[PDB]
Amino acid sequence: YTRVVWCAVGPEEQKKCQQWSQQSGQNVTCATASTTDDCIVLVLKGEADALNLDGGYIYTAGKCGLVPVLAENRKSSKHSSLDCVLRPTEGYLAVAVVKKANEGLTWNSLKDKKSCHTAVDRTAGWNIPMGLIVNQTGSCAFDEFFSQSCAPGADPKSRLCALCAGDDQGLDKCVPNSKEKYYGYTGAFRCLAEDVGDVAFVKNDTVWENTNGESTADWAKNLKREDFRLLCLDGTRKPVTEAQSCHLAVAPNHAVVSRSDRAAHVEQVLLHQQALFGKNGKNCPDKFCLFKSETKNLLFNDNTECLAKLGGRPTYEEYLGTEYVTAIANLKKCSLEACAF
């Protein structure tokens, strides 16, 4: 009865999920959809139990009644006493990244430039940067700010998708799943690396994890951190080592969400699954590692140490934080208290 149906977004996550299922002895099975929004709908219908989501999607899911269950917790340095599962999350740093060689480009000269976003509706790749831009320009025409962009999830024929590349066949251009070459943290950063875009809206960790040999992938294996710069809100440019004083915002960690009535069961199963396939899991790396997918961040971000319990049994609003929730609310007024489905 404690069989948990995970929802994989796209064929690559589906593949990983199938392996997880096999190894879990069917304690976890898989449902697959083409987009995160579609997965959310599968959960709402009760045809899937849960999935890990970025804060922007948590907002969508929460408005529809879904709740936070456990949050991704990466490596920390503070509070090192507590066990990962009980350690409070620290959130991640949303940043705007450019090539150092692209001299003179600052936060204040982004207009008409080319941009790379993780996907529409995501925290670092969309909600934070576009919310800030809309705000500063006093215009809801965020589709006319950048000359061209790759913002997975937007209209494929629009300029917001002009830079997306689709899959190895050139198909699925701009789809919001790993099939799109420039999808997600890694895809958006690659979009910048290959100079397809002038700026990439990702998180701090993405830059470090795909530079100086941290990634063996063909497009990243030869990337050096010193060739990149972060754009601070005061118009200055800083080395990627100064993210703490040069970010667009602190984002709430991605987290697992499920229907309220399945929360308890999903939590129980996951806590047990990571004991087996997590960071120091009994069967990882020997049999299967839930938090690995060769930098592709499938199902979970690859830098996840463990899924941690949430203190205070927070509502989706409490988990995201009132400020972030309000920021999203305001941005969405551009394109009010009900489920978008």
Ligand X SMILES: CCCCCCCCCCC[C@@H](O)CC(=O)N[C@H]1[C@@H](OP(=O)(O)O)O[C@H](CO)[C@@H](O)[C@@H]1OC(=O)C[C@H](O)CCCCCCCCCCC
Ligand Y SMILES: *[C@@H]1O[C@H](CO)[C@@H](O[C@@H]2O[C@H](CO)[C@@H](O[C@@H]3O[C@H](CO)[C@@H](O)[C@H](O)[C@@H]3O)[C@H](O)[C@H]2NC(C)=O)[C@H](O)[C@H]1NC(C)=O
Ligand Z SMILES: *[C@@H]1O[C@H](CO)[C@@H](O[C@@H]2O[C@H](CO)[C@@H](O)[C@H](O)[C@H]2NC(C)=O)[C@H](O)[C@H]1NC(C)=O
Ligand U SMILES: *[C@@H]1O[C@H](CO)[C@@H](O)[C@H](O)[C@H]1NC(C)=O
Q: Which of 15, 18, 19, 27 binds ligand U (CB under 6 A)?
A: 27
**CA-CA distance, 145 to 107, in Å (whole number)?**
13
315 binds, among Fe ion, ligand Z, ligand U, none (CB under 5 to 8 A by kind): none
Q: Which of 26, 77, 322, 335 binds ligand Z (CB under 6 A)?
A: 77
Q: Is 97 exposed, middle or buried (0-12, 13-18, 19+ CB in 10 A)?
A: buried
Tell whether residue 316 is among the known ligand binding residues: no
Nearer to ligand Y, 217 or 233 (CB): 233
| H helical segments located in 3-127 | 10-24, 36-45, 55-63
**CA-CA distance, 280 to 285, in Å (whole number)?**
8
- Site for ligand X, residues 245 to 284, rule: CB under 6 A: 249-250, 252
Nearer to Zn ion, 37 or 318 (CB): 318
Q: What sign does the dihedral 201-207-211-213 (CA atoms) show?
A: negative
**Residue recorded with tokens 């709430």:** 252
Cα–Cα nearest to 255, from 29, 3, 59, 95: 59
Binding mask 87-126 for Fe ion (x = CB under 5 A): ------------------------------------x---
- Site for Zn ion, residues 290 to 329, rule: CB under 5 A: 318
Omega before 152 within 30 of 0, i.e. cis: no
Stretch that binds ligand Z, among 41-49, 200-208, 220-228, 249-257 (CB under 6 A): 200-208
Cα–Cα nearest to 23, from 339, 283, 335: 283
- Site for ligand X, residues 90 to 109, rule: CB under 6 A: 91
Nearer to ligand X, 62 or 281 (CB): 62
Nearer to ligand U, 2 or 158 (CB): 2
Tokens linked to 231: 């754009």
CB 66 within 8 A of CB 44: yes
Stretch that binds ligand X, among 21-29, 86-94, 101-109, 214-222 (CB under 6 A): 86-94
Q: Which of 28, 40, 132, 220 binds ligand Y (CB under 6 A)?
A: 132
